[PDB]
Amino acid sequence: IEAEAASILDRHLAKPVAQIRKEQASAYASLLKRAETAKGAKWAEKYLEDVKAVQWFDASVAEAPASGPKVAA
Amino acid sequence: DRVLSLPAVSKNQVLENVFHTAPKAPVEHLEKMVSANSKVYDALNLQSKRVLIWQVKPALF
Amino acid sequence: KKQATENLMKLLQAYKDIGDAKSEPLLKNHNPRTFEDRDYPVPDFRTQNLKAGDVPKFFDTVISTRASAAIASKDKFWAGRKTEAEAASAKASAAFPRVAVPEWKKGKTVSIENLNTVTDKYAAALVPKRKLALPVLPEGVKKAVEDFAASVGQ
Amino acid sequence: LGPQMEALGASDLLLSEQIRVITEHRYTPDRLQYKEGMKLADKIAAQEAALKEELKVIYGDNVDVKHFQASPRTPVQQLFDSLKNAAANKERAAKEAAAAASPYLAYAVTKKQEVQADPSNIPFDEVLYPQLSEELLELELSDIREDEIALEKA
Numbered sequence A: 001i002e003a004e005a006a007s008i009l010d011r012h013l014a015k016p017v018a019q020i021r022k023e024q025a026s027a028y029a030s031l032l033k034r035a036e037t038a039k040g041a042k043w044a045e046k047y048l049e050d051v052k053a054v055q056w057f058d059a060s061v062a063e064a065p066a067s068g069p070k071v072a073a
Numbered sequence B: 001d002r003v004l005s006l007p008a009v010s011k012n013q014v015l016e017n018v019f020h021t022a023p024k025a026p027v028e029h030l031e032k033m034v035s036a037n038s039k040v041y042d043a044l045n046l047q048s049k050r051v052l053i054w055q056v057k058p059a060l061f
Numbered sequence C: 001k002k003q004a005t006e007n008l009m010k011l012l013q014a015y016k017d018i019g020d021a022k023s024e025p026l027l028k029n030h031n032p033r034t035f036e037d038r039d040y041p042v043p044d045f046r047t048q049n050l051k052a053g054d055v056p057k058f059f060d061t062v063i064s065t066r067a068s069a070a071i072a073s074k075d076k077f078w079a080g081r082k083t084e085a086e087a088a089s090a091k092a093s094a095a096f097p098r099v100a101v102p103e104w105k106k107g108k109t110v111s112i113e114n115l116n117t118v119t120d121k122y123a124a125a126l127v128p129k130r131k132l133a134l135p136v137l138p139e140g141v142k143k144a145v146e147d148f149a150a151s152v153g154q
Numbered sequence D: 001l002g003p004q005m006e007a008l009g010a011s012d013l014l015l016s017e018q019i020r021v022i023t024e025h026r027y028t029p030d031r032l033q034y035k036e037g038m039k040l041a042d043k044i045a046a047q048e049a050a051l052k053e054e055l056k057v058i059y060g061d062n063v064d065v066k067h068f069q070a071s072p073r074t075p076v077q078q079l080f081d082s083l084k085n086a087a088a089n090k091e092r093a094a095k096e097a098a099a100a101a102s103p104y105l106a107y108a109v110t111k112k113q114e115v116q117a118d119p120s121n122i123p124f125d126e127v128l129y130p131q132l133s134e135e136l137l138e139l140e141l142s143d144i145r146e147d148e149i150a151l152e153k154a
Helices: A003-012 A017-037 A042-063 B010-018 B028-041 C004-019 C052-089 C110-123 C139-152 D013-026 D033-057 D065-070 D075-098 D103-116 D130-153
Strands: none
Touching: A003 C139, A017 A042, B010 C052, B010 D130, B028 C110, B028 D103, C004 C052, C052 D033, C139 D103, D013 D033, D033 D065, D033 D075, D075 D103
16 A cells, blocks of 8 residues: 555656646546436435535634534533 | 848847847746745645644544 | 756856856857858859849848858857866766755644745845845935925925 | 838837838848848847836836837836835735735735835846846947948948
8 A cells, every 4th residue: 555655646746736636626526426426325425425524624624723623522 | 242241140040049048037936936835834734724634643532 | 857957057057167267258159140250251243143133042042151150150169168068067066055945844744934934035035146225215214304394494 | 211211219110110111121021131130020029028018017008118118217217116106016915915815825925025115126137247238238239330330331
C-alpha cells in the first residue's frame, strides 16, 4: 500500500493543477451520477447520505477549526 | 545603389534580436507563490477554515 | 530539474562574469548591426546584366545576403561565448539563496507568522536594487507649510 | 515626398501607423524593405499597446497614446500621477483585504499594495541600468546617423 500510494502520488505530482482538478471533478461527478442513477436501492441512498455527512463534516470543521467537528455531548 | 551603403540588417531585425524574449516581471513571483502558499495556508494552519488536520489525524472523541 | 536549474544559474553567472571581464556593452552582442561587415565589396549592379524590373530583386538579394551573413556571424559569436562560459561554469561557486517557501515540518503544521515572513521575503524583492528616492510629501510638512502660508494670509 | 514631408515622430498619427504609410510610400509591396518596414510597424504597434495597457491604469481607457509616445512621462510626472490615484488604491486595497478569503491573503494584499504604493519603488530602467538605457538611446541615434551619412554622401 505504501508503494501504491507513492506511485499514485508521483504520477499525480507530474500533472499541472488544472488537469488534476478537472480529472478529480470528472471522477467525482461520474461516481456521484452512478449513485443518483440507481434509485430505490439501499446502497445508493446510504451513499448519498454519506456524501451529505462529509459535507456536514466540512461545515462543522469550518465553523470551529481549532476544536474539531462538533460532536454532540 | 545608395541602399547598399545602408546597414543591411533591418530595424525590425534589431528589435527582434535585442528584445528576443519577453522579460519576467518582478511581481510574477509574488503572485504565483502567494497563490500557492494560500493553499499551504488553507491546508495546514489549525486556524484555516478548511484545514486538513481533522481529515488526516481524525480525532478521538 | 533542480540540478539543471542550478547549472543554468551557474551558466548565467558565468555569462555575466566573462561578459564583464571584457567590460563590453550590454546590447552590442545582441545587435546584429555590430556583426555586419560595412567594408563589404558591395556588388555593382551594372555588371550583373539586369533588365528593367530586375534591379530591386538584385538589391534585395544583396541586402538579405549581407543580413544573413551578419546574423550568422552573431550566431557564431554566441556559440563561441557559450563554449567559453560552459567551460568556466564547471569551475564555479553555486552558493545561491534558496526559494523562500514556508517552513513546513513532517507531521506538524505551518504558522501564519512564517507565511507572513515568506511574503515579506517576496515583497522585499519587488523593490529595485537602485531606486529614485522620489519624495511623497508627508502630511505633517504639508499642513505646516499651508498654515505658514495662512499666517502670511496667502 | 507625400507622407515623408513630416518627420518620423512629428506627425499626428501613431508611430506604427505612420511607419506603415512611410513604408507604403517609399517601397512597393514586392520589396524586402517593405516587408521589414511592416514587421517593424507591428513591433511598434506592440509597444503602443503595451504602453496603453500600463497607461490606462492612470489616465482612463481612451488615453491618446501619441502624447505619451512623442514625449514620455518624466519621473516627477510618474510620481505625480501615482499620488493622483493613491487614495482609491488605499481604499480598494482595504476593501480587498477585508473581503480576502483568509488572513494570509489579507496580509499578502496589504503587503503587495504597501510595496506597490510607495512611489520610490517604481523601477526606472535608467536608474537601474544606466549604461543599458544609453545603448537603448544609441540604438536609434545610430540609425538616424546612418540616414544622415547617406544624406551627406548625396
